């Protein structure tokens with residue numbers, strides 16, 4: 001049995017195994033807070049997330065289970081996964097805290113594009129990695145739905161992982177079907193976000209920096225043009241349909257005149273991502289085959305996910321049932337090998 005120690009971090013007590021040393025706060029995460037740490041077992045740097053009040057209500061309890069199940073399933077180099085999961089609890093009766101461990105990623109995408117004019121080759125690599133991770137999570141019928149630079153973790157060598165998938169926020173990267181609440185959408189909501197992110201990496205400017213939902217919609221329509229009646233099919237609110245229908249008709253812009261000086265292959269990819277019709281939007285797997293990524297693309301190294309059983313999502317269980325199921329998942333966790341890759 002590991003010896004734990006207590007340390008106050010972010011004005012609360014963390015209780016962690018001696019294995020993890022030199023904890024230092026590196027910001028909030030989804031439903032928790034995160035500390036960097038040194039794993040004395042492997043000499044690796046890790047990030048430890050302590051969930052906040054994981055069993056306070058059935059909402060917290062189910063999202064705790066959801067997140068632990070999801071992270072236990074994710075095994076991809078561009079997707080956050082688990083090195084460890086622990087609790088100071090000695091039994092289910094004591095079980096009230098959950099800590100999740102992953103490799104340390106020092107930055108997010110906003111740290112990369114802020115004070116640096118990125119080269120096109122570097123933008124290619126960053127977007128390629130997002131799409132590789134999206135192909136994987138999408139293959140398991142998991143969608144991010146709120147992909148944005150602050151949800152892309154990046155290390156010192158621009159290696160990137162998607163986080164907080166499948167779970168006041170900026171809406172500047174959200175797919176229009178999400179932001180304004182369409183009755184049905186698909187996995188390519190995330191591809192819209194990639195388009196917005198890529199545009200910003202190329203120009204240094206946020207593509208659609210709207211001040212409210214209506215201002216953001218008008219910015220979007222100025223670029224991609226007014227939608228046809230067909231897309232009104234997806235909007236339930238009559239007042240919203242009436243408003244959009246009421247707008248003066250706008251032509252789609254030629255993206256080549258918007259992204260002056262960009263790689264023409266980048267402009268072509270943006271044209272395929274930033275389309276209002278989500279059934280016309282390029283998929284992650286299709287985008288990986290686009291010539292923009294030719295120097296990185298490798299079909300042998302763009303894997304899909306094992307099937308993921310989400311049948312628990314339709315079920316209402318009691319707090320103590322979610323808590324016991326979560327405890328089961330903590331105890332059954334099998335840490336991965338330190339080295340899980342081989343030369344191609």
Ligand SMILES: Nc1nccc(-c2c(-c3ccc(F)cc3)ncn2C2CCNCC2)n1
Nearest residue numbers: 027029034047049100101102103104105108
């Ligand atoms: N520094 C770093 N490195 C890796 C991940 C995170 C992380 C996690 C997280 C998720 C699961 C897990 F098991 C452990 C940590 N959640 C939010 N963040 C963010 C903390 C600051 N914003 C960017 C990343 N932070």
Ligand SMILES: N=C(N)NC[C@]12C[C@H]3C[C@H](C[C@H](C3)C1)C2
Nearest residue numbers: 205206207208209219222223258
């Ligand atoms: N001000 C910005 N950074 N973006 C707003 C934009 C700029 C141009 C491309 C699209 C459409 C239209 C012209 C309005 C987005």
Ligand SMILES: [Ca+2]
Nearest residue numbers: 297298301344
């Ligand atoms: Ca390769």
Ligand SMILES: [Ca+2]
Nearest residue numbers: 339340341342
């Ligand atoms: Ca190896």
Ligand SMILES: [Ca+2]
Nearest residue numbers: 077157159341
């Ligand atoms: Ca490596």
Ligand SMILES: [Ca+2]
Nearest residue numbers: 298300301344
């Ligand atoms: Ca090969």
Ligand SMILES: [Cl-]
Nearest residue numbers: 073307308309
């Ligand atoms: Cl599974």
